[PDB]
Amino acid sequence: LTGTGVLTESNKKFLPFQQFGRDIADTTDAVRDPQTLEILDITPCSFGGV
Amino acid sequence: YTMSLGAENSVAYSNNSIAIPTNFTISVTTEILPVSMTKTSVDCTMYICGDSTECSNLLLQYGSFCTQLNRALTGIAVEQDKNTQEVFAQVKQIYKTPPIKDFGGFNFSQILPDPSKPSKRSPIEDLLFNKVFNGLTVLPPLLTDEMIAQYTSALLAGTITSGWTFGAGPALQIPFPMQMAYRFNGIGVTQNVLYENQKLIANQFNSAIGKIQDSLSSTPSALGKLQDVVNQNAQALNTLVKQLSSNFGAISSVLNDILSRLDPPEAEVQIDRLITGRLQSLQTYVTQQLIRAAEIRASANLAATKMSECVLGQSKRVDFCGKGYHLMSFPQSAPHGVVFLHVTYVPAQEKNFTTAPAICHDGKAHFPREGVFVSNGTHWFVTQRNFYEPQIITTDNTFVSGNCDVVIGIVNNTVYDP
Amino acid sequence: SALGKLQDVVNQNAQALNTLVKQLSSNFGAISSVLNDILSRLDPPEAEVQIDRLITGRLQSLQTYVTQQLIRAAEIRASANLAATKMSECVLGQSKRVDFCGKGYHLMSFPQSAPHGVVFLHVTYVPAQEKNFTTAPAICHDGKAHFPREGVFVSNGTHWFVTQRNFYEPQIITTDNTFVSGNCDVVIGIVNNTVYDPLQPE
Amino acid sequence: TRAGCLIGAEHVNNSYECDIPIGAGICASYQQSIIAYTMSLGAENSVAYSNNSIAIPTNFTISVTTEILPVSMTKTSVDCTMYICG
Ligand SMILES: *[C@@H]1O[C@H](CO)[C@@H](O[C@@H]2O[C@H](CO)[C@@H](O)[C@H](O)[C@H]2NC(C)=O)[C@H](O)[C@H]1NC(C)=O
Ligand SMILES: *[C@@H]1O[C@H](CO)[C@@H](O[C@@H]2O[C@H](CO)[C@@H](O)[C@H](O)[C@H]2NC(C)=O)[C@H](O)[C@H]1NC(C)=O
Ligand SMILES: *[C@@H]1O[C@H](CO)[C@@H](O)[C@H](O)[C@H]1NC(C)=O
Ligand SMILES: *[C@@H]1O[C@H](CO)[C@@H](O)[C@H](O)[C@H]1NC(C)=O
Ligand SMILES: *[C@@H]1O[C@H](CO)[C@@H](O)[C@H](O)[C@H]1NC(C)=O
Ligand SMILES: *[C@@H]1O[C@H](CO)[C@@H](O)[C@H](O)[C@H]1NC(C)=O
Ligand SMILES: *[C@@H]1O[C@H](CO)[C@@H](O)[C@H](O)[C@H]1NC(C)=O
Ligand SMILES: *[C@@H]1O[C@H](CO)[C@@H](O)[C@H](O)[C@H]1NC(C)=O
Ligand SMILES: *[C@@H]1O[C@H](CO)[C@@H](O)[C@H](O)[C@H]1NC(C)=O
Ligand SMILES: *[C@@H]1O[C@H](CO)[C@@H](O)[C@H](O)[C@H]1NC(C)=O
Ligand SMILES: *[C@@H]1O[C@H](CO)[C@@H](O)[C@H](O)[C@H]1NC(C)=O
Ligand SMILES: *[C@@H]1O[C@H](CO)[C@@H](O)[C@H](O)[C@H]1NC(C)=O
């Protein structure tokens, strides 16, 4: 699962079988780290109009 | 069932019967109008391609479609501030009310700013406000809710302390009861009616305002007109975002998955499919926003007209400033819109009188100068048409034109000469 | 910048046309933006594919242009309707609608022709040089409450006068410019004064 | 600001009429350097209100104002077939 963003510690209570989560846009917003099983939140890197 | 169009009501019409109100009520009605729309902004390239260089380069093959789309949304965003300005920024000065709110019994505490709250909103405005990732951002309004509230309070202060004069030239102070008396004259009711019933009128007014706050509080649908605008735009954005999950014929809706699997000669085909679909989706969104923006603009223009004609003056346009005879209006700030409290004079408790087009006296035909000739069954009087007030018929309230042999339905009576 | 409102319309349409024209230079996935180059190089079985790409792109570009013109036309129509209303109510008559025919009390208006538009010169009456007076809702005289027939009762500190509300012109209070309704015990703020009767001297 | 981070403009306490809108009550102007400020909504003006005081104009002026409205749009015409296919 590839992408670009900022990885932070998640407070989302994933069920034992869930590998990643999605927001209302149906895009990945959280993943389960395949080695530590830590849940990480994914946010986009700061952006905006100039 | 088959719907009713209303209760049937026959009018007791005859060639010599007139009904005249012996009383009246002060009614306050609420009109809610959208003024502005959320200033959304969509980054065309990011929406379609995200941070993919490969997609971006293919997007360029479509020319300046993204420039047109970014431009169209920018144009709307600018309009939204213009709409707000046209409605609220109609007063050059920020008028303040006096420390002592003595308006002859008229209580405006529910429409004037509440000084105990940081937001400086009126009790009614406070109620109104309480009731209502993908390159997609929202720009803030130029005028904050606080600034809109300040414009509204200035308009209220002007309306209350200087009537409509501040909407024409300088603010000319006038006692509120006297201002209301002028507004009574403006609807064909003599000024003495205001003064003689000043206590009653102030009480009917104060009661009606209290009813407004209760009506809004107990009616969740009251601000549906503003909520509908919010819902339509939120829905439009949600749909636009959801379209990013569509394949449009591609092996995947995810641009990164295509790029990680395929080489450029094949990725281009899958990407092109996503670009076509996403570009089409964005064009659909923008078109709908332009059409919707036009509707909001029209509403804002209507609101601006009402601000000028209902608040900064007294309207003679029927049903333009509430149902009844317009006396005055008070603006209230609302979420992306304006609420007008229309104060109208409504005739009440009418009764039947016998009437005549003229009085015959000394061979002359006498016509009423201002009012109408009515009989209570034994005596003829002349009275103002909008409020029963039976005066003796005299040469000072009638005029003569022609003889008694011309007017159809002319009746014999005495015309008193002082 | 005075005529920016008319220039903006010209600029928007010129911009729309320039964009439409520029789109002809786009490939839209084709080997070339130039239809003649495609036809000179490829045979029909292959040219059709490249041409189809240009048709889709150019047709889409034209549809975009037309849609924008229809929406823009609607805005112009609304403006024209407003202008027509003002022509009728500001020029062919005197308006009582506030801020409809200029800021102030509308007297009259004069239309002027302009490039793709109309300019209205609104002539308004604007009150000036106001001063403070003491006022009253009524005058009490001989037990009767007298109200002004047209104007307002004002005092200069020693004498009461009745004057038109929009222009200071202090007339003597008489029975010919007031009317009686009720007694002096009803009106709040009623003041004692004399009401002159033109017949009394005779 | 609530509109984002504004860099290069000097923020001041003095409020002025809005020149270049930034958003959320903030405007910028050239005063020399570029400054940022909270926009004024107009001068404050208290009315000398009382239950027996009226102001009456002893004079007047005749003002002429200009209102400019679009009436028509350039009557463009596009030949669809020629535009697309030449
Ligand atoms: C104007 O009306 C408000 C009510 O809308 C009055 O405020 C109320 O005053 C009573 C005391 O007489 C309190 O018990 C209520 O709780 C108050 N209500 C609110 C919302 O404050 C106010 O006093 C009136 N002002 C005048 C001059 O009559
Ligand atoms: C005109 O109608 C008003 C009500 O709209 C009358 O005032 C009410 O009179 C009753 C007594 O019959 C009181 O109990 C109410 O409290 C009064 N209401 C208010 C707001 O004061 C008024 O008396 C009527 N006048 C005439 C001539 O009929
Ligand atoms: C290997 O991955 C598992 C998770 O499946 C984890 O529990 C284990 O500690 C990992 N071992 C090492 C050496 O990383
Ligand atoms: C006038 O008289 C008719 C009966 O002919 C009656 O129905 C009507 O209600 C009366 N109108 C009023 C105001 O009393
Ligand atoms: C009509 O009004 C006069 C004056 O108040 C009164 O004397 C007379 O009795 C009234 N007639 C009727 C039928 O009420
Ligand atoms: C009303 O009609 C009757 C006939 O039914 C007639 O005698 C009377 O004079 C008419 N009155 C008026 C004012 O027309
Ligand atoms: C009014 O009185 C005159 C007499 O002065 C009489 O000739 C005429 O017929 C009367 N008209 C009516 C409607 O009573
Ligand atoms: C009326 O008096 C007040 C002082 O109470 C003053 O500020 C105001 O300018 C005066 N108005 C006029 C028109 O002179
Ligand atoms: C009020 O007007 C009268 C009549 O012109 C004048 O005699 C009197 O002195 C004036 N009073 C004041 C205070 O100006
Ligand atoms: C104005 O208020 C004062 C009390 O401060 C009172 O004495 C006076 O009679 C009131 N005048 C009017 C017209 O209400
Ligand atoms: C007006 O004069 C009468 C005496 O005719 C007096 O009783 C009343 O109190 C006076 N009212 C005022 C406001 O001076
Ligand atoms: C604005 O005023 C505040 C005090 O309220 C002060 O701390 C701040 O430095 C001032 N900023 C400027 C540059 O005017």
PDB file of C-alpha atoms in Angstrom, chain B residues 60-65 68 71-72 79 82 90 104 164-173 175 178 182 185 190-192 195-199 268 272 276 279-280 283 286-287 290-291 294 297 305 308-309 312-314 317 320 370 389 391 396 418, chain C residues 5 15-16 19-20 22-23 26-30 57 60-61 64-65 67-68 71 74-75 78 96-100 103-105 125-128 130-133 135-138 147-153 165-166 179-182 186-188 199:
ATOM      1  CA  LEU B  60      -1.783  18.968 -19.981  1.00  0.00           C
ATOM      2  CA  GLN B  61      -2.863  17.281 -23.216  1.00  0.00           C
ATOM      3  CA  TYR B  62      -6.376  18.517 -22.503  1.00  0.00           C
ATOM      4  CA  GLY B  63      -5.366  22.160 -22.730  1.00  0.00           C
ATOM      5  CA  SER B  64      -6.673  24.691 -20.240  1.00  0.00           C
ATOM      6  CA  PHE B  65      -9.767  22.902 -18.926  1.00  0.00           C
ATOM      7  CA  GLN B  68     -11.364  27.332 -16.741  1.00  0.00           C
ATOM      8  CA  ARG B  71     -11.388  30.300 -12.722  1.00  0.00           C
ATOM      9  CA  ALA B  72     -15.099  29.504 -12.596  1.00  0.00           C
ATOM     10  CA  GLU B  79     -19.407  36.790  -5.962  1.00  0.00           C
ATOM     11  CA  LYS B  82     -20.180  40.743  -3.191  1.00  0.00           C
ATOM     12  CA  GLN B  90     -25.813  49.541   2.988  1.00  0.00           C
ATOM     13  CA  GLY B 104     -42.173  55.113  24.253  1.00  0.00           C
ATOM     14  CA  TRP B 164     -35.557  56.197   7.291  1.00  0.00           C
ATOM     15  CA  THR B 165     -33.694  59.483   7.079  1.00  0.00           C
ATOM     16  CA  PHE B 166     -30.301  57.836   7.498  1.00  0.00           C
ATOM     17  CA  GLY B 167     -31.058  55.779   4.397  1.00  0.00           C
ATOM     18  CA  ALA B 168     -31.428  58.937   2.300  1.00  0.00           C
ATOM     19  CA  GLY B 169     -29.009  61.449   3.795  1.00  0.00           C
ATOM     20  CA  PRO B 170     -27.799  62.156   7.375  1.00  0.00           C
ATOM     21  CA  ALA B 171     -29.387  60.434  10.347  1.00  0.00           C
ATOM     22  CA  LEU B 172     -32.056  62.753  11.712  1.00  0.00           C
ATOM     23  CA  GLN B 173     -33.101  61.831  15.223  1.00  0.00           C
ATOM     24  CA  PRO B 175     -38.794  60.123  18.944  1.00  0.00           C
ATOM     25  CA  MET B 178     -43.379  59.987  16.344  1.00  0.00           C
ATOM     26  CA  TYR B 182     -45.350  58.803  10.393  1.00  0.00           C
ATOM     27  CA  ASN B 185     -49.705  58.019   7.990  1.00  0.00           C
ATOM     28  CA  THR B 190     -54.112  59.112  10.849  1.00  0.00           C
ATOM     29  CA  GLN B 191     -51.338  59.848  13.344  1.00  0.00           C
ATOM     30  CA  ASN B 192     -53.688  60.307  16.270  1.00  0.00           C
ATOM     31  CA  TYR B 195     -50.772  58.260  19.848  1.00  0.00           C
ATOM     32  CA  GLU B 196     -54.195  57.456  21.277  1.00  0.00           C
ATOM     33  CA  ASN B 197     -53.395  53.751  21.216  1.00  0.00           C
ATOM     34  CA  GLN B 198     -49.663  54.113  21.829  1.00  0.00           C
ATOM     35  CA  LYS B 199     -49.725  51.831  24.861  1.00  0.00           C
ATOM     36  CA  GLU B 268      -1.011   5.960 -19.667  1.00  0.00           C
ATOM     37  CA  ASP B 272      -6.218   8.519 -19.284  1.00  0.00           C
ATOM     38  CA  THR B 276     -11.430  11.627 -18.460  1.00  0.00           C
ATOM     39  CA  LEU B 279     -12.242  15.758 -15.307  1.00  0.00           C
ATOM     40  CA  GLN B 280     -15.833  15.103 -16.353  1.00  0.00           C
ATOM     41  CA  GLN B 283     -16.817  19.822 -14.824  1.00  0.00           C
ATOM     42  CA  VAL B 286     -18.485  23.354 -11.410  1.00  0.00           C
ATOM     43  CA  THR B 287     -21.418  23.674 -13.797  1.00  0.00           C
ATOM     44  CA  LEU B 290     -22.392  28.166 -11.388  1.00  0.00           C
ATOM     45  CA  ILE B 291     -26.098  27.526 -11.821  1.00  0.00           C
ATOM     46  CA  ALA B 294     -26.889  32.294  -9.965  1.00  0.00           C
ATOM     47  CA  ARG B 297     -27.113  35.812  -6.433  1.00  0.00           C
ATOM     48  CA  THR B 305     -33.687  45.238  -2.337  1.00  0.00           C
ATOM     49  CA  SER B 308     -33.272  49.118   1.067  1.00  0.00           C
ATOM     50  CA  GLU B 309     -37.061  49.204   0.744  1.00  0.00           C
ATOM     51  CA  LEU B 312     -34.196  51.751   5.057  1.00  0.00           C
ATOM     52  CA  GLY B 313     -37.701  52.901   4.171  1.00  0.00           C
ATOM     53  CA  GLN B 314     -41.398  52.088   4.165  1.00  0.00           C
ATOM     54  CA  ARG B 317     -45.446  47.233  -2.468  1.00  0.00           C
ATOM     55  CA  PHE B 320     -43.044  42.786  -0.468  1.00  0.00           C
ATOM     56  CA  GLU B 370     -59.961  61.850   2.645  1.00  0.00           C
ATOM     57  CA  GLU B 389     -63.466  57.000  13.385  1.00  0.00           C
ATOM     58  CA  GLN B 391     -66.562  62.350  12.311  1.00  0.00           C
ATOM     59  CA  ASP B 396     -63.979  71.175   6.137  1.00  0.00           C
ATOM     60  CA  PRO B 418     -68.449  75.737  11.249  1.00  0.00           C
TER      61      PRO B 418
ATOM     62  CA  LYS C   5     -19.046  46.802 -15.037  1.00  0.00           C
ATOM     63  CA  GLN C  15     -11.463  35.507 -22.572  1.00  0.00           C
ATOM     64  CA  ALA C  16     -14.000  32.782 -23.306  1.00  0.00           C
ATOM     65  CA  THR C  19      -9.782  29.940 -24.478  1.00  0.00           C
ATOM     66  CA  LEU C  20     -12.019  28.209 -27.011  1.00  0.00           C
ATOM     67  CA  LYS C  22      -6.515  27.901 -27.767  1.00  0.00           C
ATOM     68  CA  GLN C  23      -8.118  24.497 -27.201  1.00  0.00           C
ATOM     69  CA  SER C  26      -4.424  20.689 -27.747  1.00  0.00           C
ATOM     70  CA  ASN C  27      -3.709  17.091 -28.730  1.00  0.00           C
ATOM     71  CA  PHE C  28      -6.247  15.467 -26.425  1.00  0.00           C
ATOM     72  CA  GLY C  29      -4.145  12.310 -26.720  1.00  0.00           C
ATOM     73  CA  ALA C  30      -3.771  12.545 -30.493  1.00  0.00           C
ATOM     74  CA  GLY C  57     -11.676  17.018 -27.072  1.00  0.00           C
ATOM     75  CA  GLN C  60     -16.074  18.925 -25.230  1.00  0.00           C
ATOM     76  CA  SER C  61     -14.301  22.280 -25.429  1.00  0.00           C
ATOM     77  CA  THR C  64     -17.916  24.001 -22.226  1.00  0.00           C
ATOM     78  CA  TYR C  65     -17.893  27.336 -24.031  1.00  0.00           C
ATOM     79  CA  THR C  67     -22.611  26.238 -21.357  1.00  0.00           C
ATOM     80  CA  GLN C  68     -20.686  29.178 -19.923  1.00  0.00           C
ATOM     81  CA  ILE C  71     -25.086  30.938 -17.833  1.00  0.00           C
ATOM     82  CA  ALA C  74     -28.705  34.636 -18.006  1.00  0.00           C
ATOM     83  CA  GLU C  75     -26.778  37.130 -15.891  1.00  0.00           C
ATOM     84  CA  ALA C  78     -31.187  39.764 -15.483  1.00  0.00           C
ATOM     85  CA  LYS C  96     -40.532  55.928  -4.208  1.00  0.00           C
ATOM     86  CA  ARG C  97     -38.348  52.851  -3.900  1.00  0.00           C
ATOM     87  CA  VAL C  98     -35.383  53.506  -1.639  1.00  0.00           C
ATOM     88  CA  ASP C  99     -31.965  53.154  -3.280  1.00  0.00           C
ATOM     89  CA  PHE C 100     -33.639  52.092  -6.507  1.00  0.00           C
ATOM     90  CA  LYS C 103     -29.094  57.350  -2.945  1.00  0.00           C
ATOM     91  CA  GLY C 104     -31.353  60.088  -1.588  1.00  0.00           C
ATOM     92  CA  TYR C 105     -34.873  61.142  -2.492  1.00  0.00           C
ATOM     93  CA  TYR C 125     -32.683  65.428  -3.258  1.00  0.00           C
ATOM     94  CA  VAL C 126     -30.368  65.143  -0.289  1.00  0.00           C
ATOM     95  CA  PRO C 127     -31.233  66.855   3.036  1.00  0.00           C
ATOM     96  CA  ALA C 128     -28.490  69.079   4.421  1.00  0.00           C
ATOM     97  CA  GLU C 130     -30.066  69.903   9.893  1.00  0.00           C
ATOM     98  CA  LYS C 131     -30.485  71.388  13.343  1.00  0.00           C
ATOM     99  CA  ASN C 132     -31.992  70.274  16.677  1.00  0.00           C
ATOM    100  CA  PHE C 133     -35.557  71.207  17.664  1.00  0.00           C
ATOM    101  CA  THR C 135     -40.826  68.352  19.306  1.00  0.00           C
ATOM    102  CA  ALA C 136     -44.229  67.186  20.475  1.00  0.00           C
ATOM    103  CA  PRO C 137     -46.824  64.667  19.194  1.00  0.00           C
ATOM    104  CA  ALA C 138     -49.617  67.175  19.763  1.00  0.00           C
ATOM    105  CA  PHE C 147     -52.201  67.209  15.557  1.00  0.00           C
ATOM    106  CA  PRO C 148     -50.301  68.589  12.524  1.00  0.00           C
ATOM    107  CA  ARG C 149     -52.050  67.970   9.212  1.00  0.00           C
ATOM    108  CA  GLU C 150     -48.877  67.580   7.177  1.00  0.00           C
ATOM    109  CA  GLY C 151     -45.818  68.511   9.204  1.00  0.00           C
ATOM    110  CA  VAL C 152     -44.372  68.237  12.697  1.00  0.00           C
ATOM    111  CA  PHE C 153     -44.612  70.462  15.768  1.00  0.00           C
ATOM    112  CA  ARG C 165     -40.800  67.284   7.915  1.00  0.00           C
ATOM    113  CA  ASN C 166     -38.219  67.319   5.132  1.00  0.00           C
ATOM    114  CA  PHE C 179     -56.734  68.865  13.235  1.00  0.00           C
ATOM    115  CA  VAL C 180     -58.439  67.881  16.464  1.00  0.00           C
ATOM    116  CA  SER C 181     -58.873  64.380  17.788  1.00  0.00           C
ATOM    117  CA  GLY C 182     -59.692  63.647  21.415  1.00  0.00           C
ATOM    118  CA  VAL C 186     -54.713  60.853  26.120  1.00  0.00           C
ATOM    119  CA  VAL C 187     -51.596  61.850  24.178  1.00  0.00           C
ATOM    120  CA  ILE C 188     -48.289  61.109  25.869  1.00  0.00           C
ATOM    121  CA  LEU C 199     -61.469  83.834  12.096  1.00  0.00           C
TER     122      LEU C 199
END
